[PDB]
Design a protein around this ligand. Structure first.
Ligand SMILES: NNC(=O)c1n[nH]c2ccccc12
Length: 286
């Protein structure tokens, strides 16, 4: 509103645009997300308001929720860079494995926290992960997914969502995070689909077309078609080279087809991959 100087636009989320703004009175710098030629819905500001109570070092703090002038505004703590920009910036050299590991460990801590509070993200992507100069990484925009869906990015979507499941579980966030982990390691998106079917078939071509053996109930899913081509699962050491075996093992558990078999954030934190985890400082150019 008129409370801010609104320094500049900084991104377009699946649910709305975000702005860097300075409280024209307290001097506080924040990220202001405007929820909205489509339509301006409304249902539970109560739901979102509850999120203001989420407090964890790996969750971007939601400072306020404002419903006004036929618009919803979420005021968030501001972080200087998102992971998408950091990966692009680190494209020539790659993010050091210790930093990738630190970021994955922290993101799992944030998800373990949200999931233990029965809060799902549902739309995790590099643009939704924010980093600061001190080596922290935080998840932003949790629990928003309460409406329909730059073209939306399908790259991090769990297969059960693509197959039309009506009830999703915390497993969908683990899937997205696994996709992001792979991308930090290889410096290329794992499943860059350009449509829902292409997204699905890119997953099938790599992990093999799922069947009742690996995923009980898959053939009865809403959009499952017996006509799906049957691709054999790929080696996997071919998937995220040159990640070590602990990393590959953990990733494979985050990418299990059956959401019931997919590793939880809490269990992932105990994986051997994190035995030597540290907290490096990244080289951030702001
Ligand atoms: N460059 N900074 C950002 O994009 C940002 N900072 N805090 C957020 C909270 C939610 C969404 C984005 C953001």
């Amino acid at each position: 509103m008129e409370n801010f100087q609104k320094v500049e636009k900084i991104g377009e989320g699946t649910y709305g645009v975000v702005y860097k703004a300075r409280n024209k009175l307290t001097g506080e710098v924040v990220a202001l997300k405007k929820i909205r030629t489509e339509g301006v819905p409304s249902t539970a500001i109560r739901e979102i308001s509850l999120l203001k109570e989420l407090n964890h070092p790996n969750i971007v703090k939601l400072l306020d929720v404002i419903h006004t002038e036929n618009k919803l505004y979420l005021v968030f703590e501001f972080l200087h860079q998102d992971l998408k920009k950091f990966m692009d910036a680190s494209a020539l050299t790659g993010i050091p494995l210790p930093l990738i590991k630190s970021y994955l460990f922290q993101l799992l801590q944030g998800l373990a926290f949200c999931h233990s509070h029965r809060v799902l993200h549902r739309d995790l992507k590099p643009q939704n992960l924010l980093i600061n100069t001190e080596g922290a990484i935080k998840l932003a925009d949790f629990g928003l997914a309460r409406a329909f869906g730059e073209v939306v990015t399908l790259w991090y979507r769990a297969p059960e969502i693509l197959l039309g499941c009506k009830y999703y579980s915390t497993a969908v966030d683990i899937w997205s995070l696994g996709c992001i982990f792979a991308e930090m390691v290889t410096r290329r998106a794992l499943f860059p689909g350009d449509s829902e079917i292409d997204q699905l078939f890119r997953i099938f071509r790599t992990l093999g077309t799922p069947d009742e053996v690996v995923w009980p109930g898959v053939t009865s899913m809403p959009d499952y078609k017996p006509s799906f081509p049957k691709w054999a699962r790929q080696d996997f050491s071919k998937v995220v080279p040159p990640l070590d075996e602990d990393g590959r093992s953990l990733l494979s558990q985050m990418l299990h087809y059956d959401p019931n078999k997919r590793i939880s954030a809490k269990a992932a934190l105990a994986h051997p991959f994190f035995q030597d985890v540290t907290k490096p400082v990244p080289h951030l150019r702001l």
